[PDB]
Amino acid sequence: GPSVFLFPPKPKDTLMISRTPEVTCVVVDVSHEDPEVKFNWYVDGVEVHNAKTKPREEQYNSTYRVVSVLTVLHQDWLNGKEYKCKVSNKALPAPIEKTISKAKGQPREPQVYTLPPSRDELTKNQVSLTCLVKGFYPSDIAVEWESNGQPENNYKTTPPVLDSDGSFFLYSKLTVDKSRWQQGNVFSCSVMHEALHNHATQKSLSLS
Amino acid sequence: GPSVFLFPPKPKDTLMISRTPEVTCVVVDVSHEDPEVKFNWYVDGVEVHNAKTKPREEQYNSTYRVVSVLTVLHQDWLNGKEYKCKVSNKALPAPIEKTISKAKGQPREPQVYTLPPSRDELTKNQVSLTCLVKGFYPSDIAVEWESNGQPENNYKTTPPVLDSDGSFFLYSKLTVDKSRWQQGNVFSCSVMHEALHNHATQKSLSLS
Numbered sequence A, B: 001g002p003s004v005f006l007f008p009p010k011p012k013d014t015l016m017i018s019r020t021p022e023v024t025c026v027v028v029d030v031s032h033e034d035p036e037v038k039f040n041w042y043v044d045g046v047e048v049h050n051a052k053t054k055p056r057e058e059q060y061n062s063t064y065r066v067v068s069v070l071t072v073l074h075q076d077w078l079n080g081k082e083y084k085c086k087v088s089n090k091a092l093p094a095p096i097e098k099t100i101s102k103a104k105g106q107p108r109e110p111q112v113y114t115l116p117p118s119r120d121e122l123t124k125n126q127v128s129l130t131c132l133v134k135g136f137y138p139s140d141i142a143v144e145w146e147s148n149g150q151p152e153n154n155y156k157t158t159p160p161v162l163d164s165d166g167s168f169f170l171y172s173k174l175t176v177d178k179s180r181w182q183q184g185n186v187f188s189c190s191v192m193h194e195a196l197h198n199h200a201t202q203k204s205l206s207l208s
C-alpha cells in the first residue's frame, strides 16, 4: 500500500517575486513489486502541464519515493487557488488525489515587538534578543535576524502558535555576545508575510 | 492487523508527588473475529503485574479498543527506566512490543527570564508579558502564569524548540489589560522541570 503527502511552497518563496514557489507532491513506499507511477496536476480543476516529475530517491529501509514538483504563480497561490495532485499507478485500481491551498481567511498583518535582554541575563557572556511577532494570519511567515545589513547566525525561531483571538504569534531569539550588545550594535528582526506592505517589515533593537 | 500505541505520562505527573504518573498502552483495530487481547508489562525487562486493564470498548467503526494503564513510580520514570508493553493475539503472527522511557541525556536546568512589553505596545488596550525559558534538557516541561497566587488564564506557550547548543527553549506569552500592568500589578511565571530545585521555579514580572 502506497501513500501521498501534498506540500505547500515556502512562505518566503511566494512573497518574493525573485523566487520560484513550488507544490511538492510526495509518494512514499513505492515497492519494487510495482515501481511505476504517474502524476496529473490541477489548478481549480484545470489540468496543467508545467510539472517536473523528478526521479526517484532510494531509501534505507527498502522503500522508494517518487516526487512531482509544480511551479506556481505567486498571485495564484496568494489568491488561494486549490492545487490538486492526481496520482496514478497500476498498484492502485483507483487514482489517489490530494488537494491543498493557502489557508483561507482574512490576512492579518503581524505586529513586531523586539525585546531587550533581561537584567538577570547580563550575568552571562552571551545574551538573548527577543522578537515578538503576533496577530498574523495565515500562519505562513518568515523571520530573520540581521545586523548592519548582514545576517545573524545564532538565531532560532519557534513555530507559529494559534493564539486566543484566532490569529498567530511566534517568537525569535537571537543570541549574541554581551559584548556586541553593550557596545551599542543595532539589530533587526526582519519579518516576511503576505499582509505586510511590500510583504516585509523590519524592527530595530539596540541598547541606546 | 491491529495497531499499538504507548503514551508516556504528562511531565507535571512525574514532577509532582501530588500527582500520579502513568504509562498508557492503547490497542486499536482489534478484530471482531479474533477479539481477545493480552497485555504483558515489563519495566527494564522485569515483568510487573500492577497494570490495570480497562474493559474492551466497541468502536463505531466495528473494531475494538482496549486500554492498559500501568502506574509508575516518580523516581522510576525520572531515573529513566524502560517500560515495555507486550500485546498478544492469535490474529498476530507474533506479539507486538512497544517500549518507552524518559529522554536519555544529561538534564539541564532551565534559565527563566521575564521580559516586559515593548513600549510600542502601550497603544493597545491589552499588553504582552513574556517568559523566556531557555537551556533546559530534557524538553519535558510545564509553564504556568499566575498573579497574587491565583492562576492566570489568557496565556499561550510555544512548543519547546531545539536550540543551537543541544538544549531547549520556549516562550510563554501572557496577555493582560493595559490597566492591570500599569497599576503596578505583579505577575508570576512558574516553571516545572526535573532539573529545578523542588522541580519548580517562579519568576516575577512587575512595573516599577
Ligand SMILES: *[C@@H]1O[C@H](CO[C@@H]2O[C@@H](C)[C@@H](O)[C@@H](O)[C@@H]2O)[C@@H](O[C@@H]2O[C@H](CO)[C@@H](O[C@@H]3O[C@H](CO[C@H]4O[C@H](CO)[C@@H](O)[C@H](O)[C@@H]4O[C@@H]4O[C@H](CO)[C@@H](O)[C@H](O)[C@H]4NC(C)=O)[C@@H](O)[C@H](O[C@H]4O[C@H](CO)[C@@H](O)[C@H](O)[C@@H]4O[C@@H]4O[C@H](CO)[C@@H](O)[C@H](O)[C@H]4NC(C)=O)[C@@H]3O)[C@H](O)[C@H]2NC(C)=O)[C@H](O)[C@H]1NC(C)=O
Residues within 6 Å of the ligand: B003, B005, B007, B008, B024, B026, B028, B029, B058, B059, B060, B061, B063, B065
Ligand atoms: C476505529 O476507531 C478508533 C477510534 O476512533 C474513535 O472512535 C470511533 C468510535 C469514532 O468515534 C472516531 O470518530 C473516533 O476518533 C481508531 O483509532 C485511532 O487509530 C489511530 C491509528 O490508526 C490512532 O492514531 C494515533 O494517535 C496518536 C494520538 O492519539 C492521542 O491523541 C488523539 C488526538 O490526536 C486522541 O484522539 C487519542 O485518543 C489519543 O489520546 C491520548 O490518550 C492517551 C492515553 O489514553 C493520553 O496519555 C493522552 O493525553 C491523549 N493525547 C491526546 C493528544 O489527547 C498519535 O500520536 C499517533 O501518531 C503517531 O503515529 C502516526 C501513524 O501511526 C504518525 O504519523 C505520527 O506522527 C506519530 O508517529 C509517532 O510519533 C512520535 C512522536 O512524534 C514518535 O515518538 C513515535 O515513534 C511515532 N510512532 C509511530 C509508530 O508512528 C497516531 O496517529 C488514534 O489515536 C486512534 N484513535 C483513538 C481514539 O484510539 C481506529 O483507527 C478506527 N479504525 C478504523 C480503520 O476506522
